[PDB]
Amino acid sequence: QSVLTQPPSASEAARKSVTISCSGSSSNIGSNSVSWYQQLPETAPKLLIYNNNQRPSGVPDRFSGSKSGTSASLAISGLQTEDEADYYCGAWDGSLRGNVFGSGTKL
Amino acid sequence: NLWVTVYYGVPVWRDADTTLFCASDKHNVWATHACVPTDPNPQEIHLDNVTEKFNMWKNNMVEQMHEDIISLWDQSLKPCVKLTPLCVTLHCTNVTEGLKNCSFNMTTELRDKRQKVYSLFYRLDIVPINENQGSEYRLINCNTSAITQACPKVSFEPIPIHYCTPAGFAILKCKDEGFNGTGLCKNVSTVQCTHGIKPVVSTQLLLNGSLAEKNIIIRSENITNNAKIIIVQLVQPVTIKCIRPNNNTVKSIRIGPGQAFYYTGDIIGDIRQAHCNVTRSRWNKTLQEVAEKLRTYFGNKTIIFANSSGGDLEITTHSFNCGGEFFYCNTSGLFNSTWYVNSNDTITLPCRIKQIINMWQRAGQAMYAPPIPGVIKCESNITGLLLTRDGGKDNNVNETFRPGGSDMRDNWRSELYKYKVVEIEPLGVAPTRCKRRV
Amino acid sequence: NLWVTVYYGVPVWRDADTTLFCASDAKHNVWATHACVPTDPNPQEIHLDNVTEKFNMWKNNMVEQMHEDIISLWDQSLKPCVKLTPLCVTLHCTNVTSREGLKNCSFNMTTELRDKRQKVYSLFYRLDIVPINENQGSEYRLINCNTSAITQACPKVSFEPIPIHYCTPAGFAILKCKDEGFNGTGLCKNVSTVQCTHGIKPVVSTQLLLNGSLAEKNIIIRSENITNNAKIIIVQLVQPVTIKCIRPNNNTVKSIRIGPGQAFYYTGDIIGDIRQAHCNVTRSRWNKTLQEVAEKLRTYFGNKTIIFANSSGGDLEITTHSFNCGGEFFYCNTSGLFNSTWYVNSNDTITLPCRIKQIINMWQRAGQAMYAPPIPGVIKCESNITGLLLTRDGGKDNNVNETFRPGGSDMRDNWRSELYKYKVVEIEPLGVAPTRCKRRV
Amino acid sequence: NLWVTVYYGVPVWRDADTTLFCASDAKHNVWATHACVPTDPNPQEIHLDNVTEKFNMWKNNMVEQMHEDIISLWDQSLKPCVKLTPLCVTLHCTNVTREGLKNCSFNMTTELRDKRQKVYSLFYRLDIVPINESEYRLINCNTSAITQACPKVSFEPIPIHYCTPAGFAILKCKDEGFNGTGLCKNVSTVQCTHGIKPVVSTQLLLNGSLAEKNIIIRSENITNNAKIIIVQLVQPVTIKCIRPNNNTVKSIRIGPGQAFYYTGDIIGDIRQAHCNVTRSRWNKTLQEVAEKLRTYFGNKTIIFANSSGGDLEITTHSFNCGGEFFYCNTSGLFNSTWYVNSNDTITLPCRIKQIINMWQRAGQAMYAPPIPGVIKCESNITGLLLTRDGGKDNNVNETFRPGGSDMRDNWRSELYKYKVVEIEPLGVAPTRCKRRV
Amino acid sequence: LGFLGAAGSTMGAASITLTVQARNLLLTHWGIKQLQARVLAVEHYLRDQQLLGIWGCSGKLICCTNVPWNSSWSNKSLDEIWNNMTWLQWDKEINNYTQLIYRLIEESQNQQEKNEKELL
Amino acid sequence: LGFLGAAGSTMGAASITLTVQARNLLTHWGIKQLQARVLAVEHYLRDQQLLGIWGCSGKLICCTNVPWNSSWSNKSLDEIWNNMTWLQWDKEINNYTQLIYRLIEESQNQQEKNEKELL
Amino acid sequence: LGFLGAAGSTMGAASITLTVQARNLLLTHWGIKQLQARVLAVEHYLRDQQLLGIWGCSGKLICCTNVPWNSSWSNKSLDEIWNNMTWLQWDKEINNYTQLIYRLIEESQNQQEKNEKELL
Amino acid sequence: QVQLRESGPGLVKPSETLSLTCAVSGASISDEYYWTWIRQPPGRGLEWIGYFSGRDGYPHYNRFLESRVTISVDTSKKQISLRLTSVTAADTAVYFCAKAPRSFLYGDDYGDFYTESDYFDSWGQGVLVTVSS
Ligand SMILES: *[C@@H]1O[C@H](CO)[C@@H](O[C@@H]2O[C@H](CO)[C@@H](O[C@@H]3O[C@H](CO[C@H]4O[C@H](CO[C@H]5O[C@H](CO)[C@@H](O)[C@H](O)[C@@H]5O)[C@@H](O)[C@H](O)[C@@H]4O)[C@@H](O)[C@H](O[C@H]4O[C@H](CO)[C@@H](O)[C@H](O)[C@@H]4O)[C@@H]3O)[C@H](O)[C@H]2NC(C)=O)[C@H](O)[C@H]1NC(C)=O
Ligand SMILES: *[C@@H]1O[C@H](CO)[C@@H](O[C@@H]2O[C@H](CO)[C@@H](O[C@@H]3O[C@H](CO)[C@@H](O)[C@H](O)[C@@H]3O)[C@H](O)[C@H]2NC(C)=O)[C@H](O)[C@H]1NC(C)=O
Ligand SMILES: *[C@@H]1O[C@H](CO)[C@@H](O)[C@H](O)[C@H]1NC(C)=O
């Protein structure tokens, strides 16, 4: 089950700088990486930001990440129509001995 | 008119302290294979008209034997797999009490790859990293010393060891029946060196030692002092049988290149608490004679026994090494009786197994006893007790005797009571009517 | 009437064994010859006319004591050297690209900073790498990694076996047999006493004796029981047989720092063509040498067909000829030197295929392993073959022939060929005999 | 005619080195004085005359034995301490909130092997080097493993007596103005030398033995251009030192119970450490040194320069004050010149160093833990280690520079009045004695 | 009697067995231990032998010296000491001031052989 | 001749060079040599102490006052000192060597006792 | 007076105070250093002590010999050698052939003398 | 570049074991990676199942599913297998075989330490798994 927490949906128009938030506890968010992911409809997800704010190859500068204590959030700006997808946050949970993801914020 | 003459090879001596080498009649922690093979015929010479004075408390050979035993223990552990890598976060759950099913990942031979394992560690050897929180236990003594495993082959069998002094010295042996520890021994005999002494390590109860000659004897440097240990020796041994019912299947893994680590993988059958047995009739009678003799040194006050002082397990419990494993038995069932001047059946002593130990009470070193496969049984003889009277108050009719001492030297002092090393002085001078010719 | 009289400083002795200390000719040596006491410039040799003493080399304690001493030296030398514990990592190796005994292993090793790793491409001999997964490949774990930790041999020290004189303490003497043709056991007639043994080069060799002492004027065969098939047979040659060894691989050594200030040496690349190492020995000399050995072997046990086979089979360390020259460890296949038959009647070199091994266990010990660093440049090694270690596998009754297999699987046998002339004796300066004298009062 | 005779016990001796063992005054010291045998409560200062034996400090082997022995004790007292292997980790540093201090941060293993704690400590710039051009690396990490000096043992030099085994005696030269190589009178004999302090210093002798009534200059070859010239002062020139930084020590548990110490914070402003010396005494001392030096050689024109150059170890002073080590720039003490004709305190700037190899050994490194609070250490300057730099012929002047780069010279200035000899009492002589029969 | 089997015997009886008391004077942890113990035995044995050499009693069980017995050390007659007291308690009687008799014996013998050489 | 050179000569003549044989009786390598060095002293003192108690201190040839026992050897004096050497002579007395010492021990002590009371 | 306090004294004064000289003749790193030093003293003491035993001078400090004094060893008279000469320079000029002079006393005198005395 | 592709039965009955596999291409199966299995029920959150270290060669599973799933890998044909015993209707989800890098954190004399399964670089195409009669 998803131990992390994030808003179920943050849908709205484009051309702004919406910021999806993700929170947890010292067991998972406040102990290691806060990698995020994107999941397009009826297909497997893809990686957007790994570690804390490091970006992978192929992803433009539009996507960014941040960490603050036991909280987190995904920062984006200049959105477009293809951004309509489900975003998930992830981190390794020390207590559960297994990585867990968030509830999934639909954009 | 009398001149003076000087003698050589005179039969006299003086109390001295000298290095003592060992001797035994490769596969033991004592490393007796390097000792000089003891001569099969014990060279004992009786001394007539000699009433030499003895004092075991100020005897220095007991301290030397304690130091040497520490060296052999460390020398034997020196060439062994260092469990330093076991200082990892341990996730443990209750077994499917005194045992926990700990799980973690450990370095294999190839540093690049790790290996997940499931080991059963006793609660005494596991402490919680998170106060109160569950899981996240860590190995005890990880915050104070480096854990070292005992090479599985070298056995802890306390085989006899003879302490012999180099040439020019001698060890006087007291043969008086029922020696009281200190005084003038009227039956002395000179021996090249001490007899086979078993270095068995134990506290609160002396096992496999020497028995008295005809009656129970009590020894103490100052029996009236509470801070001074009271060593008691029995004339009749009280057999004690112990057993850890767990089948204890052993498993092995290779941590680092070449080094191997043994642990308890699974337990076949029902898990039962380790315990020790002693005949109630025999032990009950032993306390009667002990209290009977104890009334001779003190007044006619009633003698009662309590269940130790309380505190750390290493000092407040009877700890004995048998069958390659270390036990920690609760001796409260033995010292729970009162005695006066007027005056199926086995007393069970609960025991707890422990792998991580600090036998010599040193915080700089840690010993990890590997689990022995299969059930282990131990049968030994109780030959002495370590008592300490709690007379800190101005008692008038009571005399509380609490088992204790806490000093490891007391174990060997109970056996080396009849020995004293003295340096030979083969030069003497006396008057004589003689004249050295030109 | 007679009386007993005691004599001090009497010239008598008794068989005994005692602690022996070396003495070397006047730091950076494996045997610590520099720390050894300097040898006596005057070889004080005293002959013993009319003296007849029996020597039993197979029952002495010198070789047994020297064996333990040499092991402690080898180890005391490896003790302060870099420990390659971090080298036990999965190695991705591929065929060397520039015959198939070298592999190009790539591995991630630790660096001075404990939080950084360095990828290093090294060339390791196949004999020192074992497949992690037999089915697949490109995953080769360093050999001896599942038995003991590896300890790099210091490169500044040398493994050359310079002579060392084993000397007894004061009050002890070492007899020296000089009877020409004296076999293993017997009553030596030409006995002599010396302060201590001559320069004994502690050469480490198996299946053959290199740079050892030669015979006086004839082949000598020594053994405690010639008829016993399980016992070792040592043969001493009168004419040395020169053997030349070479490693055509012009390896280029490279150095990397692992951990805090600990360097690691390995083979970077091979300049030029890659060719297997081998050893050359004149066929005429060896063929003629065995003719004398076969002629002499036919003397002890009677005239029968002498045959030589190619080892008894087993691991490399015991079925191949070992070397210690040029800072390298060769493992030559001597099948060509023992592939002949000799009846009663009866350019030009024999090539010995050789394989080099870096991770080795010279003393057949599983609790310790050593890594020999590579030596830059084409190493050459020339030595004299003076002795042979033979074993007869005639378990079944020999009717007309029996095969002699070289080997022994024991290291004490090679040094026995250099200490057969000696025996430690404890001089007893006290003696008693009857005399016609009575002391005054 | 005469017959030969043999005498046992003869009072003679022969020059021959022998193994020497210590003897301390009657566990928790680097020199292991308590483990050493106790010294004689009353050393025998036996008087002797008409012996006129020659001495040579530049040829005796006892000074060399002490050098190897002192190094052994350092390793003997250093190996039981905690080995700081995990400290060799990448360091992230920034300027302290002052150019000689760097506020470094790094990961360090805690009591668990799988847990690392982010610590903040201040490391002097001398013990830090860039790994690339912010990440910094601890110095000497690429040469040898670092070892921590246990605070339980102090580096304060205490006197230690060096005694010979029975049968060997140490002669004691007592001639006035004993320069060295030559013949010495009033040579007394004792079972062993007096209490000598194994002080660690460079280019300046501290707490050493002072001369009786005049400055003394010695060297194996005073006329050579590459041989150390030791100088012994007649009176001591007291030197003061201080570390104005008020360091606060913080401890953290590492590995299997091992402890570690480091500098946590600084109370107040940060000021460079320095050492003071009275200009009146130092000028007078060097003024008199030139007078004594004028008798040996040179065109009566003495010149003093600020060292000859090289690394910090040989070009600067050395101390072991209360556990801390200093390195002072002696440019202020050798910036004078003179001829035949001829507040108030000279200050020496210094730099504190933790990672050190005082014995010039590249195979081992010692990390001195920081001592909390300000510390001072007053010492007495008793000698100078100078060497001429006369690369050109002596025409009108010559330059004298401090240094030497050899640690043995520190002990040669103290063991100058001692020589070990072997007593060979078995001697022969012609006589008219006859052996009766 | 055996080794040291006459410590409590009378003076005269103990003086007959001096030879037996004088003849009995002669992994890596035990090796160094034993080595240090053997060296002590040799050093201890030589500690007494050197005294015999300087006292003019080289290799002699019974030896006489040119030193008169001072009554201050003891005032007991030659009868009770050699027939009643034993060597064990006799040492206690001279437990103190024992070095002075040794010092008097070595100095007395020091000037003995010198006079012999002059006479010779 | 040299050290141990007269071992093969006849016993009687071999007894003329005892001085040369008695003259030569006196970190891994350091400990090994140290253990061997002290062993030499033990061997020397083991045999030297006996002469110190046998009244033969500093005497190469020392006659005793103990009569020879025919049980130890019935050979004649003429053949023993001119036929064989010490190498084989010791092999015939080794059985009684120690006993021979004990007889000399008490014999010498008695001499000291009788000489003491006599003087 | 003290140990080795007659080194620079005259020959006669040194020949009367040899007894004192003969009397005084005999963490983990300290163990081997002390042991190796202690044993050296035993070796040194026994080095010259065994020589006296072979020479028949055990315990006899001013021992005599039975070897004539070769004129080539010293072209000097006994009067001046003992009036004000000291032992140091005297030994410094006799270090040459010290083994050869010892042989005559060691073999030609003691070994031969005891052999002749055996003819009793 | 690494390619993952699942394969297995899309329809499985309840109460039996669900067995499916996922091929690997572009990188050796025994490489320094974490072959992790992920599942996402229809329109629900994403949850983790277990992983099998390619280099360490040992499996790990979620504590809530530790008693039902067993992951195995065949090095011969480079394919990881997922065996979920006692499947139920609550397990219907799109299983994804993703890879996570076993990045090096810091070394030690006794062995190196690495990151756990996090920041999956690649994901499989996804296999739909339904469970009903
Ligand atoms: C395979 O093995 C590896 C190890 O080889 C396993 O990886 C380890 O797993 C554990 C458990 O998940 C991780 O522990 C966590 O570390 C976090 C970081 O630590 C912070 O605090 C430290 C404090 O240290 C001091 O205090 C602690 C106790 O609080 C002592 O144990 C320690 O000795 C010190 O005295 C700092 O040192 C550090 O810098 C950080 O600031 C912790 O935050 C975390 O604890 C929090 O969360 C826990 C989970 O909820 C909770 O229980 C705690 O109370 C606390 O709130 C926890 O300790 C290791 O970091 C990790 N090591 C590495 C290198 O990865 C791996 O899981 C295992 N895999 C499998 C499949 O089993
Ligand atoms: C048997 O003895 C021979 C002759 O001593 C040994 O040959 C010598 O081998 C060593 C190396 O082990 C060679 O030393 C090296 O040589 C070169 C050229 O000088 C150089 O690289 C080094 O400085 C070093 O000295 C030496 O040259 C060589 N001598 C000869 C004459 O060939 C041989 O190694 C011995 N064999 C065994 C098995 O011990
Ligand atoms: C050897 O024996 C012969 C014959 O008896 C004899 O002449 C010769 O001297 C002996 N040799 C020695 C060294 O004594």
Residue numbers in the entry:
A (entry chain L): 1 to 9, 11 to 27, 27A, 27B, 28 to 95, 95A, 95B, 96 to 104
B (entry chain E): 33 to 57, 65 to 135, 152 to 186, 186A, 187 to 309, 312 to 323, 323A, 324 to 356, ...
C (entry chain A): 33 to 58, 65 to 136, 151 to 186, 186A, 187 to 309, 312 to 323, 323A, 324 to 356, ...
D (entry chain C): 33 to 58, 65 to 135, 151 to 186, 189 to 309, 312 to 323, 323A, 324 to 356, 358 to 398, ...
E (entry chain G), G (entry chain F): 520 to 545, 568 to 661
F (entry chain B): 520 to 545, 569 to 661
H (entry chain H): 1 to 35, 35A, 36 to 52, 52A, 53 to 82, 82A, 82B, 82C, ...
Structure paper excerpt:
Here, we report 11 lineages of V2 apex–neutralizing antibodies from simian-human immunodeficiency virus (SHIV)-infected rhesus macaques and determine cryo-EM structures for 9. Envelope complex structures revealed eight different antibody classes (one multi-donor) and the complete repertoire of all five possible recognition topologies, recapitulating canonical human modes of apex insertion and C-strand hydrogen bonding. Despite this diversity in recognition, all rhesus–V2 apex antibodies were derived from reading frame two of the DH3-15*01 gene. On the negative side, to penetrate the apical glycan shield of Env and bind underlying conserved positively charged residues, broadly neutralizing V2 apex antibodies must contain heavy chain third complementarity-determining regions (HCDR3s) that are exceptionally long, anionic, and often tyrosine sulfated.
The cryo-EM structures of 6070-a.01, T646-a.01, 42056-a.01, and 44715-a.01 (solved with 3D molecular reconstructions at 3.6-Å, 3.5-Å, 4.2-Å, and 3.9-Å resolution, respectively) revealed modes of recognition similar to antibodies PGT145 and PCT64, which represent an extended human broadly neutralizing antibody class that utilizes a needle-like hole-insertion mechanism to recognize the V2 apex. A single Fab of each of these antibodies bound at the Env C3 symmetry axis with extended HCDR3s inserted directly into the cationic trimer hole. T646-a.01 similarly formed salt bridges with R166 from all three protomers mediated by HCDR3 residues D100c, D100d, and D100g, while R169 from two different protomers was recognized by E32HCDR1 and D56HCDR2 (bottom). 6070-a.01 and T646-a.01 each recognized N160 glycan from all three protomers despite comprising the phenotypic neutralization group enhanced by N160 glycan removal. However, both lineages reoriented one of these glycans outward from the trimer C3 axis (6070-a) or into a horizontal conformation parallel with the Fab-combining surface (T646-a) (denoted with * in Fig. 3, a and b); this is in contrast to other human and rhesus PGT145-like antibodies that accommodate N160 glycans in a more vertical conformation similar to their conformation on the unliganded trimer. The induced glycan reorientation to accommodate 6070-a.01 and T646-a.01 is likely a barrier to binding, resulting in the enhanced potency of these antibodies once N160 glycan has been removed. The fourth group, comprising lineages 6070-a and T646-a, was distinguished by dramatic enhancement in neutralization potency (100- to 10,000-fold) against heterologous viruses lacking N160 glycan; this stands in contrast to previously reported V2 apex broadly neutralizing antibodies, which generally are N160 dependent. In addition, similar to antibody PGT145, antibodies 6070-a.01, T646-a.01, and 42056-a.01 each contained tyrosine-sulfated HCDR3 tips that penetrated deep enough into the trimer to form salt bridges with conserved residue K121.
